[PDB]
Amino acid sequence: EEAPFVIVESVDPLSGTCMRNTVPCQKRIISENKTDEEPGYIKKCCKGFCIDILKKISKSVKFTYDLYLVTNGKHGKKINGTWNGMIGEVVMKRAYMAVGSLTINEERSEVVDFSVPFIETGISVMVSRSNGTVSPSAFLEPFSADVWVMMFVMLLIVSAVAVFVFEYSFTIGKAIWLLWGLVFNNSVPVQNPKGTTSKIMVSVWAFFAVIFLASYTANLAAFMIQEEYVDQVSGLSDKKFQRPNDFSPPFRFGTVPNGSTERNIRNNYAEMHAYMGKFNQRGVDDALLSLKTGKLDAFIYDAAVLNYMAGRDEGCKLVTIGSGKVFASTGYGIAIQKDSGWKRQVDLAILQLFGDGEMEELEALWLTGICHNEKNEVMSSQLDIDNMAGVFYMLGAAMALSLITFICEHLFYWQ
Amino acid sequence: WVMMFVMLLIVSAVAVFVFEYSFTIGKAIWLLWGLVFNNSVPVQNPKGTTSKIMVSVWAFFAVIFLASYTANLAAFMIQ
Amino acid sequence: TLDSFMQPFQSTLWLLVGLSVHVVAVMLYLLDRFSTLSSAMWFSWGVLLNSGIGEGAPRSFSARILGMVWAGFAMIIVASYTANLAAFLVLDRPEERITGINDPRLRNPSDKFIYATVKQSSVDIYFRRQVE
Amino acid sequence: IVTIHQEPFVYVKPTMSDGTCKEEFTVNGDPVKKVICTGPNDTSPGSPRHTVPQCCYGFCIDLLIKLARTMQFTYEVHLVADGKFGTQERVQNSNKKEWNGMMGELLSGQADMIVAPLTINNERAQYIEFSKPFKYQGLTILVKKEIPRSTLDSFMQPFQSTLWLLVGLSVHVVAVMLYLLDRFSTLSSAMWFSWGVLLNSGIGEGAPRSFSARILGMVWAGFAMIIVASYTANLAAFLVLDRPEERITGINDPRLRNPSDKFIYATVKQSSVDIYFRRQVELSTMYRHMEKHNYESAAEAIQAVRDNKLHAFIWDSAVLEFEASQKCDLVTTGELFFRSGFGIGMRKDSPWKQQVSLSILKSHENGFMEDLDKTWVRYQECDSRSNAPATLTFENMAGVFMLVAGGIVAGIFLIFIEIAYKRHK
Amino acid sequence: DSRSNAPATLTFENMAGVFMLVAGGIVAGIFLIFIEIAYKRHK
Ligand SMILES: *[C@@H]1O[C@H](CO)[C@@H](O[C@@H]2O[C@H](CO)[C@@H](O)[C@H](O)[C@H]2NC(C)=O)[C@H](O)[C@H]1NC(C)=O
Ligand SMILES: *[C@@H]1O[C@H](CO)[C@@H](O)[C@H](O)[C@H]1NC(C)=O
Ligand SMILES: C[C@]12C[C@@H]3C[C@](C)(C1)C[C@@](N)(C3)C2
């Protein structure tokens, strides 16, 4: 039993059995080790995705079946060179066939024989969604250096020609100071000349300055309305994973053990496993619950169930990195005892569903969610210091330039 | 807007009380009105020292208010 | 509509800009001393709030450049403030909207979601008769 | 080996006189493995169809090299004669049915391994037993997108010519009204008192003493502020709204669901997409329109789409996406359907089946396939979304820059007029 | 009302937040004037 593929639920107490569109799945219960009673069994009935696909294949091939849940063990890890769980049971000829979530790799394929995959998945990660937007230097986004230097040179030229007009106590510093103060919302208080043509020129400059400012605010606001949300971690080769201890208090991320994900990550990267050695978690539900309370920063598991779980949780506060980039993409399958004639038959029968298109409707019915991955990007708010540090950096640079220029001028006038 | 008008009235009365301890009620209302719309119109300064503190908060109010009006307006037009 | 002065900004920004105003006033006083003491703060505050108050611009050159950049800062601050206010003002989450009969909310009901109709009506006949 | 080049899995280029082609260094300069192919020259039938030697390279050849080195066998590749994937077709009105294309090449003695973009379906799984796929994919649709509106002029965009005139008349009208009020109970000063407050700039010290005139000015200041705010809001609202596009949703689009005389689309001849469309009974209504307009190969179809002759193209998702991000005049849209990966084809009796099927998973698990994907697929190019928030270019600056100079020359002319006026008095 | 986007005009929730500040400034004005005259007369 596994949540998005095979679901088990109690039978109807009044009728004595459960609803239709389902098949019974007998369940074995454990007993006291002192004296085991006669093997007890409890009638349960299982419904889901793989169960329905099995029901379709069985009618297509016209054979009967009787399925039962596994007593002990997950999908299976090797101990003492011997298997447990479903993959262990299929070897001992008691089951002869398996169905459900079972990732395909080389170790399991070296024991039993598989069928062509009918779903795509792999290794993926998810992180909580940070509130705000990545806008480091948004004030530089509007305009470009070309217009910034062009307006400098234009104001220099107009100030020079204004001084030339004044030739035929308007000084040179006051002339440029007036225009520079006036271009920025007429904030600075200055003194004005007594020349009519100079008045016309400064009125034209004021027209230009006003047109400027409104465009700049609208361009910046528009731009903000269109902001892109980018995940913090680029991928599995990011420095935030390989070098975990040097950035900040170390991240809180872990994997569920006794799984194919741990086996895949062990051989590729051992030090990561050494770090995981203390941050394991009980199960999918516990990890999903703990993600929201800040106890964990990242989570690694099979992408097939995470993609479903993202769109089913209340709200859309949980996302996945990038475009759902799967790592080491493999597919689920149907385990079959080695060297059996039914393998080719069932493999050819399952491919028949590709052409008919029934599986597409089936999976749209059984797997469609609510949330979207199309960059919702709700809003940035509160304008944290990190969002606008560059302006204060420029202010500090201007202060340093002012002090060094004052020292240089004092030295020049000292001699 | 009636709250705006009564605010101008009460601030003008407070300014007169300040001046008790060529500023007149004719130019005080002119200044209070002008600072609302970006202080475009030239005006006569208040010589009193505390009058500057009295009007600085009014200018702060005016700029906050003004910005909000533009901003809100953009949204309204966009929808 | 939240708090007018707290919706787009945190307090830390207010304290930081106030400290910047004070330190730039001190710097203006230092430049004036090296080459009015009570007028630097008035100049800074008038530039910050676009007030009609004003006594006199500094006479030094580097003081003029510093005043220019200080005047430049406030325009960026106020423009960002408006822009942030708007975005906030126009984007509202569309959550909790059932599309209809094909919504996966209804096709796979959960315990936290409850819905029902009036017994012995056309709805009961329509639902019971269909076999899917 | 028998293999074709679609877009990215095999590249075909002529060799030099020496009998090979000079190596092309990678981005880091690493060598690019190649191999001497023996394939037909040209494409169109009726040419001097005599074989020539040439060199090949791509995302698939290096995988073949790795497979050969791991399993220790030699090879000698050669391309296909007809350049078609191949499917069943009854010929000569006889009882027996025989394939053509790669199907015939592998099924009768000609080849041993098909290492190419081969799709897995029921028909080809009957006569060939495949291997585990190395790259999943699907089917998408290719369309063309239209350039949106420009940034326009500084003044023309948010205001049409009809205004400006009325505000220019009204400012002088109110100036005249103020002058008349002053005269009844300084005429030049009123013009500045009006123009400066409109322009948000301080000029002069115009302080009228009339009660009514002061009221009128106090009223007009708000009008000026409203005009400025309305202009800003107009430009901001226009600068963010985008023109909606068609962006055909997919196989459920009504345009694809029934034939139209202003919407033509096609697919390459005799391939798996044709089998998928023909096999199903309900999809005949558009297959019937498709069968009269099919083309020869994808190397010709994508060239025709740019030249405005096809409104759609149904083909592989991977190949289309690779050529969707390389040339940004074309955009891919829709959702994947008929999801089935590729594979390596074998006859039904060979240990190479098992050995290759194990080795391909071995190489797939340890990230080598991701390295190949980064090397040959994900270099990417111009892909500037669809809304594309546009930084305003010279378009805005040119007009204002020209005005500044026009104002300067008008100012010097008015200066000459000023000396004239001074002489006149 | 109708529609979905619902662009709503602002109300007194915005007004009172700044009316409190302006009223506080006005009421503190007299105290600051008293402090100012005391400091001017004492020195
Ligand atoms: C992973 O598998 C190991 C297999 O040894 C589990 O360890 C045993 O779990 C059972 C379950 O109750 C305990 O009774 C044993 O005492 C455990 N053995 C040891 C040596 O600790 C482990 O619990 C499994 N973990 C998960 C998350 O399934
Ligand atoms: C493996 O088997 C040996 C005996 O054959 C036993 O002592 C050991 O505990 C086993 N290991 C595990 C992990 O059960
Ligand atoms: C250009 C503008 C746009 C909006 C914010 C500013 C600060 C700048 C004040 C204004 N009146 C409204 C004019």
PDB file of C-alpha atoms and ligand atoms in Angstrom, chain A residues 79-82, ligand 2:
ATOM      1  CA  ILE A  79      20.900  -7.898   3.489  1.00  0.00           C
ATOM      2  CA  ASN A  80      23.332 -10.839   3.639  1.00  0.00           C
ATOM      3  CA  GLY A  81      23.061 -11.023  -0.138  1.00  0.00           C
ATOM      4  CA  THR A  82      19.359 -11.876   0.224  1.00  0.00           C
TER       5      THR A  82
HETATM    6  C1  LIG F   2      23.813 -12.201   8.279  1.00  0.00           C
HETATM    7  O1  LIG F   2      23.905 -13.591   8.607  1.00  0.00           O
HETATM    8  C2  LIG F   2      24.713 -13.866   9.760  1.00  0.00           C
HETATM    9  C3  LIG F   2      24.768 -15.369   9.903  1.00  0.00           C
HETATM   10  O2  LIG F   2      24.763 -16.010   8.634  1.00  0.00           O
HETATM   11  C4  LIG F   2      24.122 -13.172  10.985  1.00  0.00           C
HETATM   12  O3  LIG F   2      24.974 -13.389  12.103  1.00  0.00           O
HETATM   13  C5  LIG F   2      23.972 -11.679  10.724  1.00  0.00           C
HETATM   14  O4  LIG F   2      23.304 -11.059  11.816  1.00  0.00           O
HETATM   15  C6  LIG F   2      23.181 -11.439   9.441  1.00  0.00           C
HETATM   16  N1  LIG F   2      23.098 -10.017   9.150  1.00  0.00           N
HETATM   17  C7  LIG F   2      21.964  -9.316   9.245  1.00  0.00           C
HETATM   18  C8  LIG F   2      22.061  -7.859   8.906  1.00  0.00           C
HETATM   19  O5  LIG F   2      20.906  -9.835   9.589  1.00  0.00           O
END
